[PDB]
Symmetry: C6
Subunit: 204 residues, 6 copies
């Protein structure tokens, strides 16, 4: 899919944010949206075609593939990258609205966070952090962080137990670890950014 | 398909609309057209190929797949997103026409909704609301909001009853719930926007 | 295929046409070219692969698929949208030529249809109307407006009669009805536009 | 393939050519390059996959498909549209070179075909005409203008005679007739353009 | 693949090169990069799928297809078009560097090849010529300029000799001849260009 | 995938870097990102489909294909081209920040590496070199630089030993050698660039 919608929006916020916001925008840009279109989208290509279980009964393969995979991981990461990118837009909307109000009000005759922009900023960073830890918790709860080559399936209308074999488990586990460590360092960067901003705000 | 037709049209209306109109345009932009191209278009890929019923008779699979699915859900959502996006264009057309008439008439020597723009605005929001509830009612009438893995098919030229097995029911039900809740909060946002505008119009 | 050839041409005519011409250009833009790329192009994907007749003889399927379908409907609509879009270009060419001649002639020292532009306008609308009714008549003559799921085929080198089963008849009939009603309201809009223009031309 | 190479070149010649050159550029633009990307490129999709002959011998199908088709028609039309578009570029190159020489020479202190531009113009139109009739003659010599559904193949390593069945003969014959009549009216337009230009050149 | 990297680079050299350089850039533009994306990329589509040898042993087909084809021809032409396009970039780099040095040095208070630009020019043309004849020599050494329909394969783990049948030999031989004659006239154009430039350089 | 993210970033650094940095940016541009989209992405197309081992047991092919290939080479090169392109961005970020600070500070009333830019420059080149040699060492440790046509597989649930046959080993080994020699000359260029810069820095 095309990812040139947000760019004409995240570029405009890359004019009047702090340096930690700029480097977080840069890592979100170059390490997630770029990685998702390039290679990790190709690896999930032959998802259901190469999947195979050892039986002769018709239609058991679809049920076992369903029970193994509630969702593919790519659409999970896309929902994650949508939900971590909503709650920073309203900060841009608020500063754009108050800049418009400033340019309206001053003519009846820089950037400095004061008054309420601190509040919007900290609740935006808090929402980003809690969405991050929520998505990571859900991914650990459902899938874990390893994929075995052999799966045991125990669902109707198949007989008692069947064995199924995936396709490319190693590469997928590698990319799962990679997206995990990217999410981890993004959370750590947000935490140290909020810590530095609060320290400078109590220092001034 | 390409979705860069309307953008050169919905951008121009994102200059002189109210804030509720701006946030509704933003959610229609980022949560529907972006979601439709990215991931939910991929999941309906192997629609008819992976579909399978348990028989030996030729050609029964096409009839049972037809009787199960009158339309795919993606084309239904595309028709929905067309019909909720027509009746806001004529508001832009009317304000563009009267702005042209203003710029023609004033030289023979902002934005403020007065006279008839209230009427066009409220009938546009009313048409959007009734189209929304009509599409949601039709989707509840035909499909429901859950998909069973096993379907029973009872059509000629197949014998009496046959069983059919779909592909990925869980992920599709998840995305159905997701589009449902997006439509619900869009309707609620339109209702509270019209309520606020009528309250300010009787307040002034 | 790419549809960004005409746009740099139909945009230029969307500067100096009447309001009925503008709304006809808008409906031709948003309801045909947009609909053709998005969803109805996907539904004709597995056209010949899913087609199947009940025999054991090799090669009968191609002959029966040929006799059922002289052309696919999508290429028929593309030829229709080409032939309804040629005879409006020469109006733009004529007004561009006479505007160039005006800008050449005036310097040797708006828009108002006078002299011959009425003639070009009415013959353009007449050609559009007769091409519309010709294409609709041909589509009714060959295909009708419904598709049965079962077809009886009676051609060599197959034996006497064979039965064939299509793929997704319901969705295709829905989209056929949709393109029909779009063509109908386009013809009605052109007729009422010409009626209004002739009434204003005899009123003045 | 992408067809946005020549456009940044045929647009520049659509500033200082005659009206017959402009309408020939317009028909070459809208009726060939647009038609080739949109629909007629889709119809040649399942070219070799759906092709089938009635035997049990391995590998005969490739030899019979080769002997039936020296080239597909689409690549033949692409070579035709390249060879009819080369010998008009050097006219633009010559007028650009002499316009550069004019702008160099005049400062040491419109368009009017005089001197040698007549010669370049008539040899360009002559080369376009002879390439057109050469390509049409070759297409009539090899293929004819009709496709039978059944073909008889008589090549080693197949036994004596075999029968082969194509895919969609009717639609392909329709598009062959269409490209033929487009080429015919292009040749007639070039001839009447050269006739009018020579008549005006002997009239002056 | 996308070929809009070099264009923003070969366009800039199409401002200050000689006329033979301009026509060589034009033929390299319109007859190679355009031809490679359009049609000849489609013909190598079903490369390995339609390939077939007559045996019952598993896996022999991959070994015989490997021994027949060290590389496909398209990737060979892509490497050729990279290696004939590197050694002209440094000429642009040198003239850009010395133009920058001129614009730096003159303000401390056209194009004319003098001093060392002759040397860079002749070694660039020499490198282009020797790379051209090297690639053509290698292509004649490995493949020849004709493809038989039947191939005899003599490799382990297949038994003694097997026969293999290609797909579309005639069309591929046609395009091989076409790329050959394009390379030949490019080499001849470079030779006559260098001859004319040296003749004018000894004439002055 | 799209590779037009970094371009709007590596272009901006191609304004104020040294000549060795410019030619390294040029070779990274034209010989890696261009080569990866064009041809070497096509050759890894039928990766798992054409792979085949000689057995009758179900599902052994996926396990043997997994044990042969931990990752495909293309995604390995993509991770390499990401990790060699991160540690040059912060140099641009630092010079942009200090140029902004210069333009802020000077108004309270070229490029010359002094103070700390030397330090950032040498640690950037050092990080690029060590990442290059690390990736090359890992590729030599896992794969080697040759691919045999026949592989012996010794994993459960297959019986004792099985033989597997790849697809196109020769072309893949050629491209492996090609990417190897490109990486080698990139490392050598970085080394001689740092040597020249340190020699000029101790010369001044």
């Amino acid at each position: 899919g095309d990812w040139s919608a947000l760019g004409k929006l995240l570029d405009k916020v890359q004019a009047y944010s702090t340096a930690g916001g700029k480097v977080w925008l840069s890592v979100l840009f170059i390490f997630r949206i770029l990685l998702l279109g390039t290679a990790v989208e190709s690896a999930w290509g032959d998802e259901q075609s190469a999947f195979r279980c050892n039986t002769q009964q018709p239609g058991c393969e679809n049920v076992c593939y369903d029970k193994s995979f509630p969702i593919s991981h790519v659409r999970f990461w896309v929902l994650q990258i949508i939900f971590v990118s909503v709650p920073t837009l309203l900060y841009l909307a608020h500063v754009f609205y108050v800049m418009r109000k400033e340019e309206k009000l001053n003519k009846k005759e820089k950037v400095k966070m004061r008054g309420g922009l601190l509040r919007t900023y900290i609740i935006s960073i808090l929402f980003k952090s809690i969405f991050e830890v929520a998505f990571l918790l859900i991914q650990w709860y459902i899938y874990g962080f390893s994929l075995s080559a052999v799966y045991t399936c125990k669902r109707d209308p198949c007989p008692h137990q069947v064995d199924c074999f995936l396709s490319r488990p190693t590469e997928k586990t590698i990319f799962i670890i990679f997206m995990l460590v990217v999410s981890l360092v993004s959370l750590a960067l947000n935490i140290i950014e909020l810590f530095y901003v609060f320290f400078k705000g109590v220092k001034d």
